[PDB]
Amino acid sequence: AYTNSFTRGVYYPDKVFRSSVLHSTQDLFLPFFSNVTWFHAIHVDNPVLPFNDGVYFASTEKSNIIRGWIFGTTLDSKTQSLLIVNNATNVVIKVCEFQFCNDPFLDFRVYSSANNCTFEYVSQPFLKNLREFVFKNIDGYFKIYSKHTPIDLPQGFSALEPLVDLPIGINITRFQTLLALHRSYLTPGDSSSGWTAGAAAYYVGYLQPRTFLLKYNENGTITDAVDCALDPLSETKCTLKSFTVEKGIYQTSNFRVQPTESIVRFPNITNLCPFDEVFNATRF
Amino acid sequence: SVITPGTNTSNQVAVLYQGVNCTEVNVFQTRAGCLIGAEYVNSSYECDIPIGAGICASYQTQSIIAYTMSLGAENSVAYSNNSIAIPTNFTISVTTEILPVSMTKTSVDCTMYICGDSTECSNLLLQYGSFCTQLKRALTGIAVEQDKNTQEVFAQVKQIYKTPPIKYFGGFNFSQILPDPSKPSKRSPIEDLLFNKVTLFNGLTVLPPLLTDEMIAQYTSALLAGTITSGWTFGAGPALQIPFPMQMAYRFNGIGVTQNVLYENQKLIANQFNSAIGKIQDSLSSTPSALGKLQDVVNHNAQALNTLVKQLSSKFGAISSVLNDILSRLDPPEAEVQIDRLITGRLQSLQTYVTQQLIRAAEIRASANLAATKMSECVLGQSKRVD
Amino acid sequence: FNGLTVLPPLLTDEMIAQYTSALLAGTITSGWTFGAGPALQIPFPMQMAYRFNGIGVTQNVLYENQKLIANQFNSAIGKIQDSLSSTP
Amino acid sequence: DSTECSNLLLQYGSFCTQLKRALTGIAVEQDKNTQEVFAQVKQIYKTPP
Amino acid sequence: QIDRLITGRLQSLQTYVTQQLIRAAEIRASANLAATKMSECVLGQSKRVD
Amino acid sequence: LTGTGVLTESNKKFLPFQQFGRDIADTTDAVRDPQTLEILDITPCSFGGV
Q: Which residues are CB-neighbours of A23 under 8 A, at least 6 positions away? A: A213, A214, A216
Are E46 and B359 within 8 A, CB to CB? Answer: no
CA torsion F5-F9-F11-F15 (nearest 10°) is 80
In the beta sheet, which residues pair with residue A208? A29
Is residue B121 helix, strand or coil?
Answer: helix
What is the sign of the dihedral through the CA atoms of B13, B63, A155 and B8? positive
CA distance A66 to A181: 9
**Secondary structure of B15-29 as H, E, C letters:** EEECCCCHHHCCEEE
Q: Residues A181, A185, A190, A194: is their CA dihedral positive or negative?
A: negative
Strands of the sheet with B55-59, listed across from one edge = B39-40, B64-68, B55-59, B49-52
Binding partners of A (≥3 Cβ pairs within 8 A): B, D, F
Find how far residue A54's CA is from the centre of its chain.
3
The gap from C-alpha F42 to its chain's centroid, in whole angstroms, comes to 4
Question: Which candidate from A16, A21, A162 shows the least CB-CB separation from F20?
Answer: A16
Q: Which residue of B has its CA nearest to E22?
A: B359
Chains that touch F (3 or more CB pairs under 8 A): A, B
Resolution of the model in angstroms: 3.4
State yes or no: chains B and F have 3 or more CB pairs below 8 A: yes
> How many angstroms away from the CA of E44 is the closest CA of chain B?
7
Contacts of D31 in chain A (CB under 8 A): none
How far off is chain C from D32, nearest CA to CA, in Å? 10
F26: which DSSP letter? Answer: G
Residue E3: partners with Cβ closer than 8 Å, 6 or more residues away: B317, D8
Q: Which residues of C touch E12 (CB under 8 A)?
A: none
Neighbours of B346 (CB within 10 A): 20
C-beta atoms of B53 and C9 within 8 A: yes
- Name the DSSP class of B128: S
Best B300, B352, B353, B384 member to test E by mutation, with max E CBs in 10 Å, is: B384
Minimal-distance CA residue of chain E relative to B358: E22
Closest CA of chain A from B381, distance in Å: 42
* CB contact at 8 A, A156 and A223: no
Q: At what angle do helices E2-37 and D15-38 cross, to 10 degrees?
A: 20
Decide the pairing of beta strands A16-17 and F20-22: parallel
C27 to chain E, any CB pair closer than 8 A? The answer is: yes
The sheet that has A21-29: what strands, in order across it? A21-29, A208-216, A222-227
3-state secondary structure chain A: CCCECCCCCCECCCCEECCCEEEEEEEEECCCCCECEEEECCCCCCCCEECCCCEEEEEEECCCCEEEEEEECCCCCCCCCEEEECCCCCEEEEECCCCECCCCCCCCCCCECCCCCCEEEEECCCCCEEEEEEEEECCCCEEEEEEEECCCCCCCCCCEEEEEEECCCCCCCEEEEEECCCCCCCCCCCCCCCCCCCCCEEEEEECEEEEEEEEECCCCCEEEEEECCCCHHHHHHHHHCCCCCCCEEECCCCCCCCCCCCCCCCCCCCCCCCCCCCCCCCCC
Partner residue facing C41 (CB), from B18, B53, B78? B78
In angstroms, the CA A189 to CA A202 distance is: 23
Decide if B384 touches E, using CB distance below 8 A: yes
Best of F17, F24, F39 to mutate (most A CBs within 10 Å, chain A): F17
Residue of A nearest to B52 (CA): A249
Which chain E residue is nearest to residue C27, measuring alpha carbons? E43
Cβ distance D1 to A256 less than 8 Å, yes or no, reads yes
Searching chain B, which residue's CA lies closest to the CA of residue D5? B317
Of A120, A85, A76, A127, nearest to A106 by C-alpha is A85
Distance in angstroms (rounded) separating the CA atoms of residues B315 and B331:
19
Pairing of strands B74-75, D44-45: parallel
Which sequence spans correspond to the domains of chain A?
Answer: 2-256
Q: What is the rounded CA–CA span in Å between residue A49 and residue A14?
A: 28
8 Å CB contact of E47 and B384: yes
Residues whose CB falls within 8 Å of the CB of residue A246, separated by 6 or more in sequence, listed in order: B6, B7
In F1-50, DSSP assigns E strands to: 6-9, 20-22, 28-32, 39-43
Size of interface B-C (CB pairs under 8 A): 58
Of B52, B85, B87, Cβ closest to residue C41 = B85
Whether chain D has a CB inside 8 Å of the CB on C28: the answer is: yes
Neighbour-count burial of B67, counting CB atoms closer than 10 A to its CB (0-12 exposed, 13-18 middle, 19+ buried) = buried
Integer angstrom CA distances of residue F32 from A164, A276, B313, F16: 20, 79, 22, 10
Residue of chain A nearest B59, judged by CA positions: A247
DSSP assignment of B287-334, as one string? -TTTTHHHHHHHHHHHHHHHHHHHTTS--TTSS-SSHHHHHHSS-HHH
Tell me, which fold does domain A2-256 have in CATH?
Answer: Jelly Rolls (2.60.120)
The 8-class DSSP code of residue E38 comes to I
Which residues are CB-contacts of B254 (< 8 A; sequence separation ≥ 6)? Answer: B382, B384
What does the DSSP assignment read for B237-290?
SS-----HHHHHHHHHHHTT--THHHHTSHHHHHHHHHHHHHHHHHHHHH-TTT
Q: Name the residue among D25, F44, D18 with its Cα closest to residue B308.
A: D18
CB pairs under 8 A between C and D: 43
- Please identify among residues 244-283 of chain A the ones whose CB lies closer than 8 Å to any CB of chain B: 244-252, 255
Which residues on F lie below 8 Å from A15 (Cβ)? 17-20
Helix (H) or strand (E) segment spanning residue B34: strand B33-36
* Order of all β-strands in the sheet with A129-137: A37-40, A201-206, A55-61, A129-137, A142-149, A161-166
What is the nearest CA distance from C33 to chain E, expressed in angstroms? 8
Enumerate neighbours of C (3 or more CB pairs within 8 A).
Answer: B, D, E
Question: CA angle, corner D43, sides to D39 and D47, nearest 5?
Answer: 105
> What's the start-to-end Cα distance of chain C, in Å?
33
Dist. CA A251–CA D21, nearest whole Å: 10
Which residue of chain B has the CA closest to E14? B352
Q: Do chains D and B touch (3 or more CB pairs under 8 A)?
A: yes
- Show residues of chain D in contact with B71, CB under 8 Å: 39, 44
* Residues in a beta bridge with A202: A39, A59
Q: How far is A24 from chain B (nearest CA, A)?
A: 14
DSSP state of F25: G
Contact B314 D13 (CB under 8 A): yes
Option in D15, D22, D30 nearest E10 (CB): D15
How many angstroms away from the CA of B362 is the closest CA of chain F?
A: 26
C23 → chain D, closest CA residue = D41
Bridging pattern class, strands B64-68 and B39-40: parallel
Q: What are phi and psi of A83, to 5 degrees?
A: -135, 135
- B71:C39 CB<8 A: no
CA of residue B133 relative to chain centroid, distance:
32
8 A C-beta contact, residue B124 and residue B339: yes
Residue (of A194, A34, A28) closest to A105 by Cα position = A194
- Angstrom distance (rounded) from CA B353 to CA B345: 13
State whether C32 and E44 contact (CB < 8 Å): yes
Residue B33 parent element (H or E): strand B33-36
According to DSSP, the β-strands at A201-206 and A55-61 are antiparallel
User: What is the nearest CA distance from E12 to chain C, expressed in angstroms?
Assistant: 14
Nearest Cα to Cα of residue A95 among A108, A105, A81, A106: A81
